[PDB]
Amino acid sequence: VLLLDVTPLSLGIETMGGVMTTLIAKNTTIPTKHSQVFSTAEDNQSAVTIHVLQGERKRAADNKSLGQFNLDGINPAPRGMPQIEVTFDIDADGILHVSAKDKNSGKEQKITIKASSGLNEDEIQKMVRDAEANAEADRKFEELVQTRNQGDHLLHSTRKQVEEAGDKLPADDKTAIESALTALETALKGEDKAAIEAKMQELAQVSQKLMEIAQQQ
Amino acid sequence: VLLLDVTPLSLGIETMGGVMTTLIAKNTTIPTKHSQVFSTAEDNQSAVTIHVLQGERKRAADNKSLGQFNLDGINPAPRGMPQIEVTFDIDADGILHVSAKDKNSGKEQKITIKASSGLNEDEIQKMVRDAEANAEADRKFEELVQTRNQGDHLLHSTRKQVEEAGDKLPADDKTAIESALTALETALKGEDKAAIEAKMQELAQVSQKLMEIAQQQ
């Protein structure tokens, strides 16, 4: 062939933290279909927002919005348990179908995005150039997001484990862990990567007895 | 400057599943220091193996081994709770220091890797070319690894939740979930991505009542 139809920019969705997660890589020949399984961020979460992005930037907000839609009817569950399968499917006509299906409930919702949506030839190059210009900035953002999700997981988890421990955990451990969790929660509210690791460290330091109890149960 | 000292190949470690996780990207100017926080894969895990890799391939086994060492003394904990901070640090002399520290226990272990280790000029190009040749293969591997970790998490989690539920979960739910978990566990033993998703789906399908109980508690 003298010619190939290709994605000029990555395509994906916004994931927790405001980051663009790629489903279809830059430079993919179409037709193509890719899927990934995502989950909920909160206990009892009943819905998720699927926000479709075109571009190469790490902040969702710095990419082109192709549209968004909600999937609801998610059945009560602990966070991170529902399986929310997101499929990006580009046909021979270059139309994009983005679907999200709840494997438990069986509920499906979809957006269809025509081949002319998104960024024009100039902006694809503005985008490419900017992703290059801001590589260091974008990595640091992504590291901060990863750190904040880690802190959050530790926060949420430790709270559940304190609950499950009940009387097994001594007063003095409990008080120390709870103040570490307040400090952590305060830090998850900012954009200071080091402060978050500091508070995650304080928590690791005061949780030893809790971790034994949770492991034993 | 007319010249820049640069990493000719990504540097990283082996993570669960046999995948290379990058700590220092290809083409980084040195000196440089990057860190990421990892955790345990099993309840009560007391040690982790740090395996240092140079290269661009997605299977750990297809990259250059720069050495490995164990960190032990990890205190009993649920899997995914200990904070194991891995730092890669390349100094002005191009020496690499790879350290892993347990934020709870405070234990640290290290490997130091001289600037002449790893792949020579030819092999760096053999490596670059191969990562290109096998892009599709490598992605599929990485998707399979991601799927298997997801299945495993669901397996491990659901087992804990069945335990925590005890009598709240009806006989018929329990029997269905347990047979789905056997089927899942059988599938996690293979390399068949679809079979794993199929068994994760079966589990989502029979776990609705369990998920309610776990969310309520």
Partner: peptide, 8 residues
């Protein structure tokens, strides 16, 4: 609603 989280 919340954004999806990369499943664990």
């Amino acid at each position: 609603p919340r954004r999806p989280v990369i499943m664990r």
